[PDB]
């Protein structure tokens, strides 16, 4: 459920849902979505008269999420594309994007320019010898308290289409990168993605980076630079891509 | 095991201390007779009501399910006493009546107990509304009795002290369930004070990792967790 609408003193409740036919493979994990559907009941194999509820999805809508699983595909409408071309033809769109980032934060103009450069990002390049070079920039705001750095982190998490917000104290090595968990029914290990897998192709934001543990900071080096997480644990070895 | 039906669902919370007034029934199950060897019946409490056990409740004068609830005549008396000039000084002087002096302490506790207003600007900016108060003082100045009074007084109040409060005893933690071995979240001390007061005793002697793990709750009013595949 939405964290803005959780009840007082409780936990967000996970609810299992189903999609059929062309509604499948439309959402990436981590998006915020509005869903219309019927609230039906199905019997589960796991007291008295307990039949677990679910929602059969009839409709998916999300402005933050685009193009389902990413295929570098142009699904923007034609008049919106012409409006976007008009914005790209604006002689002072740089100041517009600077003022769009943090309108309620005074100063920090160079930080806002670096934030806009982070949101647009560089270009990923491929060489014939397999040399992969980075197409993203990583920005660290080091400074005194009261400079509204975490508010900039929250606004970056709001503006970016794919974004996650994490802690330094609330983090872990298997939490930011992908983790190795166990399926209950099959008793087989499987890799479940972490915070840098949910932010693939987008922005990860870290708060209190000075305080995250020394074993916890250094699982991120290949995920910042090589744009991949190479995991060889529990009989599973793989190189997942994390373009964060 | 206690059954919650109709309105009683989602009233209780994990870690919340309650007084359940309910019908004590028994039913036959085969597993207890299987593993015990005697004709033994399981016991099931069907709850008729849940009362939150807020505070010490050593006073037996508050007769009701919710002590912080009110009637219409109580609201009329609130509107009567709110229009009295000098109600601020009455609240400050009445805050912790067993402690003499310390007007700055009682004023700061009144400000922290009532709190400000959290603000949302255009769906884009968030402003913290609660007030955090530190009491630095010499021993024998009744700093902890004020904390116990806020425990009695606040609608929701959580206590922690010393080395006994861990970094994940506060904030929130994650744990592996014995059923299906899945990673599930567990609410910490700050989760149980979502619209209330968290109170720390002997703040300096607590470990730095345990002292200052509460920056995101005390600044962003939020707990961001990324561990064990849980964000």
């Amino acid at each position: 459920e939405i964290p803005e609408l959780v009840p007082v003193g409780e936990m967000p409740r996970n609810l299992t849902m189903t999609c059929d036919r062309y509604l499948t493979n439309k959402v990436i994990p981590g998006t915020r979505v509005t869903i219309v559907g019927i609230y039906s009941i199905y019997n589960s194999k796991n007291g008295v008269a307990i039949r677990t509820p679910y929602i059969k999805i009839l409709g998916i809508q999300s402005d933050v999420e685009t193009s389902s699983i990413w295929n570098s595909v142009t699904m923007f409408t034609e008049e919106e594309e012409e409006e976007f071309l008009q914005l790209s033809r604006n002689p002072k769109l740089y100041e517009i994007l600077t003022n769009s980032i943090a309108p309620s934060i005074f100063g920090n103009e160079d930080i806002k320019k670096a934030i806009v450069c982070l949101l647009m990002g560089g270009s990923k390049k491929i060489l014939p010898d397999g040399m992969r070079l980075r197409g993203d920039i990583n920005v660290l705001l080091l400074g005194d308290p009261g400079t509204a750095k975490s508010q900039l982190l929250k606004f970056v998490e709001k503006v970016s289409p794919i974004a996650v917000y994490t802690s330094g104290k609330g983090s872990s090595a298997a939490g930011l990168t992908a983790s190795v968990q166990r399926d209950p029914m099959t008793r087989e290990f499987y890799l479940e993605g972490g915070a840098m897998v949910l932010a693939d192709g987008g922005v990860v934001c870290i708060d209190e980076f000075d305080k995250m543990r020394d074993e916890d900071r250094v699982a991120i080096h290949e995920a910042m630079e090589q744009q991949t997480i190479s995991i060889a644990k529990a009989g599973i070895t793989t190189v997942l891509n994390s373009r964060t | 095991e206690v059954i919650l039906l109709a309105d009683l669902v989602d009233v209780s919370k994990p870690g919340e201390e309650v007084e359940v007034t309910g019908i004590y029934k028994n039913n036959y199950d085969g597993n207890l007779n299987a593993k015990n060897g005697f004709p033994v019946f399981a016991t099931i409490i069907e709850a008729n009501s849940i009362k939150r056990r807020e505070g010490n409740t050593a006073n037996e004068g508050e007769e009701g399910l919710d002590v912080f609830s009110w009637t219409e005549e109580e609201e009329r008396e609130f509107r009567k006493i709110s229009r009295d000039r000098g109600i601020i000084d009455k609240i400050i002087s009445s805050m912790a009546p067993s402690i003499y002096g310390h007007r700055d302490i009682k004023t700061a506790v009144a400000c922290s107990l009532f709190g400000g207003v959290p603000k949302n600007v255009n769906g884009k900016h968030s402003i913290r509304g609660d007030i955090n108060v530190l009491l630095l003082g010499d021993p024998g100045t009744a700093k902890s009795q004020i904390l116990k009074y806020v425990e009695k007084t606040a609608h929701r109040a959580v206590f922690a002290t010393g080395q006994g409060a861990s970094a994940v005893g506060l904030t929130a933690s994650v744990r592996k369930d014995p059923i299906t071995k899945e990673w599930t979240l567990e609410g910490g001390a700050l989760v149980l004070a979502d619209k209330g007061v968290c109170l720390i005793d002997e703040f300096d002697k607590m470990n730095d990792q345990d002292r200052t793990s509460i920056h995101e709750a005390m600044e962003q009013q939020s707990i961001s967790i990324s561990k064990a595949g849980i964000v």
Partner: protein, 156 residues
């Protein structure tokens, strides 16, 4: 235990359950021919308190290099909650033997390593195992009121 017939609502009461939950077989109404499907009467039936405490021998009588042998002791009636764990204590009462309840065909339980006795009709082809337990009738343990009137009443 008291049960009601589901056909003609006849009442059979004072059914005694030794070690498994049992239902009456023959309906006492001669017009009715019911054999199964009897409903329990929770209110009419009479219940007793039960407690199973697990004991082991004291460290004084443990010989060299042996794990302590264990014994289950049943407390019923007034003797429940009399013995707290970890105390040197003496139980006087009855040594009993308990059967495998799952091997007797309990309703709603699947039949469940040492070979025991068999050849019973309730067992069918299954075998029955036995465990040594105790049915204690009296317990002793060998290991406030801050008012004047109650203290002088309690005084000799």
């Amino acid at each position: 235990a008291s049960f009601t017939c589901d056909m003609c609502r006849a009442i059979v009461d004072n059914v005694e359950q030794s070690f498994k939950y049992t239902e009456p077989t023959f309906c006492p109404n001669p017009s009715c021919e019911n054999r199964a499907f009897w409903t329990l009467n929770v209110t009419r039936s009479r219940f007793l308190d039960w407690q199973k405490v697990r004991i082991q021998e004291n460290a004084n009588e443990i010989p060299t290099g042996s794990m302590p042998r264990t014994l289950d002791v049943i407390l019923r009636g007034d003797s429940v909650e009399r013995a707290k764990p970890g105390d040197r204590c003496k139980f006087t009462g009855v040594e009993i033997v308990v059967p495998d309840v799952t091997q007797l065909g309990l309703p709603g339980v699947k039949p469940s390593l040492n070979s025991g006795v068999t050849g019973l009709r309730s067992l069918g082809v299954r075998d029955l195992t036995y465990k040594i337990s105790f049915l204690a009738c009296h317990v002793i343990s060998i290991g406030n009121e801050r008012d004047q009137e109650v203290f002088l009443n309690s005084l000799s």
